[PDB]
Design a protein around this ligand. Structure first.
Ligand SMILES: [Ca+2]
Ligand SMILES: [Ca+2]
Ligand SMILES: [Mg+2]
Length: 107
């Protein structure tokens, strides 16, 4: 829901990355809808993965990225989390802020 994605695109996507170390951010962002959502929604998501409301997705909310879409879903492996944060975290503080998230989805 949060980001107004549909179940189908969400069930699709997860199937597509259910192997360990087959997760890829922009590919799942294309997939599940999010890379063509408005920037309002690209925020609504952000704040959902920010499970603890800190303003930031820390490395440990990032590895539970999937589960925000489906509870039973798998954790990301440590490499999968290391590339994302690698791609997201331009100021090197170890966690992703909104403006960084938005930035990595595009739009
Ligand atoms: Ca957080
Ligand atoms: Ca950062
Ligand atoms: Mg926390």
């Amino acid at each position: 829901s949060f980001a107004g994605l549909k179940d189908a695109d969400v069930a699709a996507a997860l199937a597509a990355c259910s192997a360990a170390d087959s997760f890829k951010h922009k590919e799942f962002f294309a997939k599940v809808g999010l890379a063509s959502k408005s920037l309002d929604d690209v925020k609504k998501a952000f704040y959902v993965i920010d499970q603890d409301k800190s303003g930031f997705i820390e490395e440990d909310e990032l590895k539970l990225f999937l589960q925000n879409f489906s509870p039973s879903a798998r954790a990301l492996t440590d490499a999968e989390t290391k590339a994302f944060l690698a791609d997201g975290d331009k100021d090197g503080d170890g966690m992703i802020g909104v403006d960084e998230f938005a930035a990595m989805i595009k739009a």
